[PDB]
Design a protein around this ligand. Structure first.
Ligand SMILES: CCCCCCCC/C=C/CCCCCCCC(=O)OC[C@H](O)CO
Ligand SMILES: CCCCCCCC/C=C\CCCCCCCC(=O)OC[C@H](O)CO
Ligand SMILES: CCCCCCCC/C=C\CCCCCCCC(=O)OC[C@H](O)CO
Ligand SMILES: CCCCCCCC/C=C\CCCCCCCC(=O)OC[C@H](O)CO
Ligand SMILES: CCCCCCCC/C=C\CCCCCCCC(=O)OC[C@H](O)CO
Ligand SMILES: CCCCCCCC/C=C\CCCCCCCC(=O)OC[C@H](O)CO
Ligand SMILES: *C/C=C(C)/C=C/C=C(C)/C=C/C1=C(C)CCCC1(C)C
Ligand SMILES: CCCCCCCCCCCCCCCCCCCC
Ligand SMILES: CCCCCCCCCCCCCCCCCCCC
Length: 216
């Protein structure tokens, strides 16, 4: 799994760049008023492109640890919520959710990092898990509520955005927990890398599809 993990970091680098350039190029296919979420999506993929290059270099030198992923997540996880809010909200409601969901997302990642940087199964490990998991549930519940007012083709397009996050993000807390039940550290890195490509490029593509619906 060592060679596979390193090779997947390179695959992710290419995938994230491909997503960045796809989203930037496609941004003109929607009306200006509907582009902001597409641009944010492209920025998320570009940040992850930058970080997978850093994480591959760290792997080459033997200095890699899972904690390096958190430098990416602490910026990209809040921004992914923002890219959803950019297609679902306007005005004061947008500013309020960006603030509240962004704070929650940062707390989730920081609490996770506190637990990540301790021995697995330690008190700190569980403390970080409980706080991050509560925040995660709070975020997922607020994402489920976001669809309540949409109709027609926007409701369908939002359903896809919501479900990619609801299903696709389960792996992150699952991977955090699994090593206390079994020898799962190695497969955790493989699955997180695959998941990041699906979640980041996929969310951008689905935000673009929503913006196409809104423009049409
Ligand atoms: C030895 C290596 C084995 C590796 C084997 C592959 C593992 C891939 C895991 C990915 C986790 C994330 C998967 C996320 C999928 C979510 C899909 C979804 O819900 O998509 C909804 C969308 O609306 C549709 O249009
Ligand atoms: C850390 C490296 C980041 C690299 C980013 C390259 C791609 C930029 C994409 C969109 C720019 C506009 C974003 C506006 C919000
Ligand atoms: C923030 C947005 C504004 C700025 C956009 C600048 C675009 C450059 C991207 C990084 C290219 C260099 C990546 C170097 C990785 C080195 C490494 O880790 O090896
Ligand atoms: C270090 C972090 C700097 C960026 C902080 C971004 C702060 C975003 C605040 C959003 C808000 O005011 O709501
Ligand atoms: C907007 C800001 C949101 C809150 C963001 C942080 C959330 C709190 C969790 C951990 C503290 C930060 C990490 C502490 C790491 C300590 C490592 C150690 O040595 O223990
Ligand atoms: C996998 C792609 C298909 C979507 C899978 C998730 C669907 C889902 O979670 O649906 C819950 C429903 O919205 C409850 O009201
Ligand atoms: C682009 C990368 C993404 C979307 C990463 C998402 C990360 C999380 C949702 C992580 C959440 C965690 C918990 C819910 C509990 C354990 C600690 C974390 C940080 C792994
Ligand atoms: C271990 C379990 C950790 C999660 C418990 C907290 C749940 C928070 C629910 C938030 C509701 C919006
Ligand atoms: C990592 C764990 C991933 C879990 C995948 C769950 C798939 C759910 C399929 C759709 C069910 C709808 C209720």
């Amino acid at each position: 799994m060592e060679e596979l993990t390193y090779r997947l970091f390179m695959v992710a680098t290419v995938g994230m760049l491909a997503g960045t350039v796809f989203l930037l190029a496609s941004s003109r296919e929607v009306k200006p008023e509907h582009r902001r979420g597409v641009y944010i999506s492209a920025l998320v993929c570009g940040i992850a492109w930058y970080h997978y290059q850093k994480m591959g270099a760290s792997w080459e030198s033997g200095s890699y640890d899972t904690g390096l992923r958190y430098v990416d997540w602490v910026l990209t996880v809040p921004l992914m919520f923002v890219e959803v809010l950019a297609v679902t909200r306007k005005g004061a409601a947008y500013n309020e959710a960006v603030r509240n969901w962004g704070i929650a997302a940062t707390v989730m990642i920081g609490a996770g990092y506190y637990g990540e940087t301790s021995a697995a199964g330690s008190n700190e490990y569980w403390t970080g898990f409980v706080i991050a998991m509560a925040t995660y549930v709070w975020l997922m519940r607020n994402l489920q509520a976001e669809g309540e007012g949409l109709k027609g083709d926007q409701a369908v397009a939002f359903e896809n955005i919501k479900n990619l996050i609801l299903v696709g993000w389960i792996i992150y807390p699952l991977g955090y927990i699994a090593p206390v039940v079994g020898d799962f550290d190695a497969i955790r890195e493989v699955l997180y890398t695959i998941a990041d490509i699906i979640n980041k490029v996929g969310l951008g593509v689905l935000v673009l599809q929503m913006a196409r619906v809104q423009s049409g």
